[model samples]
Target chain A: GGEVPIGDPKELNGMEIAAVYLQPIEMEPRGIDLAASLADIHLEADIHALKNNPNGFPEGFWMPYLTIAYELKNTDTGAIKRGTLMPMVADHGPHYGANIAMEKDKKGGFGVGNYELTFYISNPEKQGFGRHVDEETGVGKWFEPFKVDYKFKYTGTPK
Target chain B: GEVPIGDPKELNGMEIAAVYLQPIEMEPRGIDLAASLADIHLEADIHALKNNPNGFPEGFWMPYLTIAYELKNTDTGAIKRGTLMPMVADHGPHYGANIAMEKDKKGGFGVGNYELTFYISNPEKQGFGRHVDEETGVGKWFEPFKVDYKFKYTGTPK
Candidate 1:
């Protein structure tokens, strides 16, 4: 993609920059009939599914200077999975995303603490695990990722 | 320019996350010159050249975004001087000349701040200054500007 020329007297305006990607993971228990009758559908944090599930993913996988994808292999088991990769984009936060805090040290000074966090899963079924799956396909379909905000906080000592 | 739709996975590598377009800036010099005692010259910072130069002794004023050419002014006090304007085609920071700082911080702390800058100049003599004078064949020509660079000192704190 073509690069946009930044105007003269440019101000670095980024509060924070991050690269993030998505992985579709889950299996439905109640929909055992939907998946198959014999095996009970189970769902867990399948680092494997996200890692070596499959390839041949559709388009829009990446935009110029925007997003990218890669193939990863299990360290111990040598299992393989394919998924998208991006810089960890962060948002100012605490409630739903990343957060920053400042606290006074009893010694009479202040300290800044930055916390990296995972977003909360509201409805494990819909938001987290059992999101709508394609009828024709057994695997999970496309969905945008949760956006988080990262804020800079300063906690100072009391007068 | 067209956008790129590269599948990094398919490409089997990580794609570059950023790209930039840079323009060239002509320095205190030009394509070439024949040095002689008769050559006339003039110069100013890019800002003064484009905007307005107050009380420039007349005949030395040229509007921004215009090609170099002669301009007549009754108020001109100097020896029948003429000024030329910078051309629109040549007024840009040319291709592949733009710049930016890497987050890597140029391999040093705040000591090595990074930045990119460029400029432009007129190739022709406009303000009765220089060029092939039609009447006497004694027009004044501009001496080109040169590009120079300085690096941020990483070893010493200023």
Candidate 2:
């Protein structure tokens, strides 16, 4: 696991955040076991700069990355069911494509029935900020937040 | 966040459900199994189980959502960062998840690091309940057990 450092916002020139997208892995009902019917919603982030710099950070400069935070809501009632935050790092590696499973709810449990969820790439304000650190200069900056949305139907039983 | 148990052969009610790893079959886009460094698809088998006196007991549920993995260098005895697969445990008695694992280039991994480990999240509490035997004292209860197997990467050279 990598460290998430805190610092004042600094200059980040020449780097641009690439277009991020979500790839849905379809969940189908297994026979009549609707509760047992499971599939994970997969999210993807494509950083144009990281694709170019495969070896690692450029000299003293670290490329800041984004964390994925989402909110699941009841579309019918407009009630905010839950919020999930997953960190995304831009470390030095052959990682051109980044993905993670966004299923279930806050606890190690899944949401039941129909709902609407919105995904966001947040550069948070508190416990916040993900920096691509500059080892030599010791400077850092925040990545901008991006957003996407999805409508879900979890056919499991409701409590 | 589950504790690991020792290796034994007896049917300790709380034992591994199954072990499954298939050979990589490729098309034009798939890698040929001839390279030192290759990518292979991996799968693990897990089940929800209860203790039974009539030979085989079968009462299970998908209470946990994730499974853990560790790839180690067999010769050096060094463990890697490890990986986790979000499991869909609600399927049935035979439940598992599939993910892709690749061999490391350079000196990171070779045939030496072909060793792999699979772990279930909770075997005691979540799938954790008790069963009393009429004559066998008390039947030990645990939902899932861990198993280990080697993953050999087979792919053609580029």
Candidate 3:
């Protein structure tokens, strides 16, 4: 069979794509006294880490990257409670817009850079499941009304 | 209870402390396929990493560290696994024993290293499961293995 007629081999446009792994930092649960009993506080600290090659950050704002989700639980009750999701995204080649420049000022610190990302949570479920427990049994309830947003920050890891 | 007697002081020692983050170079099987079909292999690759401050062949000799494991399948089967174990002496720390000099080249490329771990499917069940039937069982066995030495060379890429 004539190999299914294909279009010109898609070009990467010299875009250097890499699989960057970001480990989410974790902290102990505070007093455990939130409306949802802090049943499960899942947070995904997404860091769009670009290829840290000898040459600095690539051009055209580094797109959103998913590193890892921070998950917590209640062992005694066998519940997952909550968790985060970090997905990986890549910008089309050309490396046009992405630029990795060095910090001009000492106050910038080593490896000073910025990134953007959004946070989201899964729907609620019955007890011992999902991130929390519903108020009155049989009658389902909404998860602790929390707010999520996409934020950007300057990251540094100088020694 | 009576008041404690000892002074509120802390002491520290200097042996050799280093940190190593196992890199997942590639995920050929995604999460589920990895947990089921392949074995998880990790090597300290010490010889080349332990000595210099930032770039030496630093060994996995840290006391406060943990290794987490997880896998994902379909929505319901997207399993997330985790465990925390003290990384004591899986393989004795051979950090400074094989420093490669100008002429005397170390047999192995890198430094004195160790193949920290290797995980495989349990023998009785498939993919380390515990159930009897093919559809409802879980991998039931676990074997942890480690090597005593570390030596690997860093070759230039063509």
Candidate 4:
């Protein structure tokens, strides 16, 4: 592992946020909505470290348990769609590995155009997941409340 | 303000996400990350993980820390920054936001493991503005901390 400070801390520190559109699919039909409702909705979020992350992670590391959510605002109409997304990993998806699986067929899906997607990430402990607690052996605490935004062009899915 | 598990449940606010390895295969543009030559799209996932010192469980997203980096082919001096933007490529309507960096004159980011440093924000120095205070909000961000990321650079020199 390599370690060298880049500018001063406190001024620059964050991650890249991106998104994609998938075809209409059912996320939870038999669970909450019953009748297989297929809305145009299909969105996926991609968040990663910088192309030059300070330090690279070991392959196959575990991503912390997070309470992740999203708010998609239509750039033109200014209207929005809100939902809680799944932090997922598919061996055969177009990604490095894990990503956010936005619900499809929910809230009528999004149409082609510019839009702003905001993700709300919180610690698992706050959301009911137990955190490790001890003097030197427990899991650390997470930043309780924080959010980030991404402006993307939601176009039609070709495949 | 709502929280759902597993499924993609709609809500408000923002956190972190990525476009890990979207190659830079196109034209040029204005710049911030320096050096002249080919631009390489490199990346890694910032998970809420617990590897060594932290000893915490597998985690996701490191909040509050002002993270930054400095690349050295395995060896120069070109740093990069910013958030990802929507990009509609041949694959479809997918926004693959990549951290674009160039090789020094003889640039081409030669393959190998490049050194990088993840800088966490010093909340006190960056401004510790309180949030909701009592409920939901911790009011203050996390303390200043730094981590290391060994970015494996597979060269593409044209």
Candidate 5:
């Protein structure tokens, strides 16, 4: 689905920077079964901000720059498979928006099991002031890790 | 804002870390003909938490780390070819970067010592990830590390 901005504008450094969206948007995982799996599942989200920053926004802007992690866990056995920690920022700013993809297995097989897809969003940056450590290197870094958990389930091919 | 796999659970202390080519024995000793070899496949070993291990103080997603490699001709001190190591890992304990390279239509590869350099990069930026200073830990770019091998192209006969 698409994002519907819900909150008031967030201020950073006394200036309005960005706005947040509703969390855990429920989505349909159709065409994502074992046999008929697709290439990727797209997550559409948006952030709101002031267009005229005068001096212009920093490189990333006040847009919704989100760092997300996807995990597919087998509800039956509690086994977990991790997806890449994706960094998403809408190319179209002000009303920042983009489609984030959750790529399926190479063979388009998400496997045949009861899977729970959990998405973790952290550090929703308003002024790009938020920071986190590099996932690969523990060095301090800047980039919003969008904070929120959106989840859904995938029931594989029935026996 | 991220999950910390943490220090104790961290396999090795967070250093720039080292990587190695796997199926290590399969290195094509020399390049005689382009048609002779099907493709080149390689795997590099790595520790998940050690490369760039700091983030939020808990278990969160780490940045995606990738490797870029260069195949060089040792004698001429020239670069023959290179490619990004195709491998991936997320919230896991280890990484085995894998790559497959096919030969060119004209010729396969030059015969000589080939130095392979792997560069590590952070998530947001392109190319290899960088290492920040030890104090602020604010690295946002990358640097390269290298390994070497020799190649000999056998022509027709002695």
Candidate 6:
């Protein structure tokens, strides 16, 4: 199936920012489990630009130099898991990526349910990915990381 | 203008997109405008790098991941080996980084059958961070693994 969109495209600086996710995959090289538990899915949050790009990046580039994080909550149980999103690619494609394993030890995977996720795309200027403003092609100017929210249902079926 | 020895293969977890050991004089952007290389553009297109996601992230092959390579000229006994920085161009990402040679007779890596190897180091310190909590984290960091590739280069870098 296609990726599940997080929310409407929101403007971050000049770039039209959006996000999406897909089911988990058994990728190679990463040959080990990241956490103590196995994830239900490898959530690839493709945080990309929509339009109106201000930074000199290509069409969908997210103004470069960004650090993405997430807060996923199991709404019914009020359970939360937070951490930085690792940038990754798969045999299928690239996803400013991550995996959604259980927040606690209870696993089989965060089984069927409604979950709320918040992605905090921090600003490049303030964060470590400093934009270079000094050079002719330098673009050090930046805005605060735009926060986007969304709700999706993992119906226990991989799309 | 070039003809690969055969199909490029995949190693470790990633697959090969393409490989080129060309004259440094060739710029990609023919090789288009880059600093106009010295003697070579040792490059490889290693996919499934776990670098960029959709669209294209930084458009460089193997992004932060590193690869070490070697070139051996069987006829003359000239050999060169070094590193490949995940680099990009108008066409998007690929792995490469170089400044080229001084052969016995000619300045270029002299022609004839040559052995080429791309020694890929593990993705340990590439800083591809993971969000592992004791309970909720997904998979652990990948172990430091090494994978390599070998191919034949006939004549000089075309």
Choose the strongest candidate by lDDT.
6
Q: Which stretches of candidate 1 lie over 4 Å from their true place?
A: A1-159, B1-44, B47-98, B103-131, B134-138, B145-158
Lowest summed lDDT across 10 adjacent residues in model 5 chain A is found at A25-34
Name the lDDT value of residue A126 in candidate 1: 26
Superior by lDDT: candidate 3 or candidate 5: 5
Model 4: runs farther than 4 Å from truth? A1-18, A26-37, A46-64, A87-89, A92-110, B1-158
**DockQ of candidate 2?**
0.02
Per-residue lDDT of model 2, residues B22-105, tens digit only:
322221112223212333323344322364322222432232224566667566555654433322111212222222333443
Q: What TM-score does model 1 score on chain A?
A: 0.18
Rank order by lDDT, top first?
6, 4, 2, 5, 3, 1
Candidate 2 all-Cα RMSD: 19.5
lDDT digits (tens) for residues A1-159 of candidate 2: 112111122222323333222232221111211122242333322322232232233322223223445565655555574434322212121111222222443343344445655556554223222121223211233345656555656443221
- Candidate 6 stretches greater than 4 Å from native: A31-37, A50-52, A62-65, A102-111, A123-130, A157-159, B1-62, B65-158
CA shift at A45, candidate 4, in angstroms?
A: 3.4
List each candidate's DockQ score.
0.01, 0.02, 0.01, 0.01, 0.02, 0.07
Query: How many collisions per candidate?
Result: 47, 8, 40, 48, 27, 21
TM-score of chain A of each: 0.18, 0.34, 0.22, 0.59, 0.33, 0.73
Candidate with better TM-score, 5 vs 6? 6
lDDT of 2: 0.34
The segments of candidate 3 whose C-alpha lies over 4 angstroms from its true place after superposition are A1-37, A52-159, B1-43, B46-144, B148-158
Q: Rate the local accuracy (lDDT) of all candidates.
A: 0.20, 0.34, 0.22, 0.37, 0.32, 0.51
| TM-scores, chain B, all models | 0.21, 0.42, 0.21, 0.43, 0.40, 0.62
For model 4, what is the alpha-carbon lDDT of residue B95? 20
Instruction: Label model 3 with its docking quality class.
Output: incorrect
List, residue by residue over B7-71, the lDDT tens digit for candidate 3: 22111111222223212122111321222222222212122123322111122222111223222
| Candidate rank order under TM-score | 6, 4, 5, 2, 3, 1
Q: Estimate each model's TM-score.
A: 0.15, 0.29, 0.17, 0.35, 0.30, 0.49
- Cα deviation of B128, candidate 6, in Å: 4.5
Predicted chain A of candidate 3: TM-score: 0.22
Can you write out model 1's per-residue Cα lDDT over B26-133, one digit (the tens) per residue?
A: 221232121121111112122212112221111221222122211111122111222222211111111111111122223222233222122223322211111111
Candidate 3 C-alpha error for residue B39, in Å: 34
* Model 4 lDDT per residue over B1-158, tens place: 11111122111111222223323432122322221333443332333323311211244333222345445555544344443222222221122223444344445445555655544453223221211212112222345454444455554423
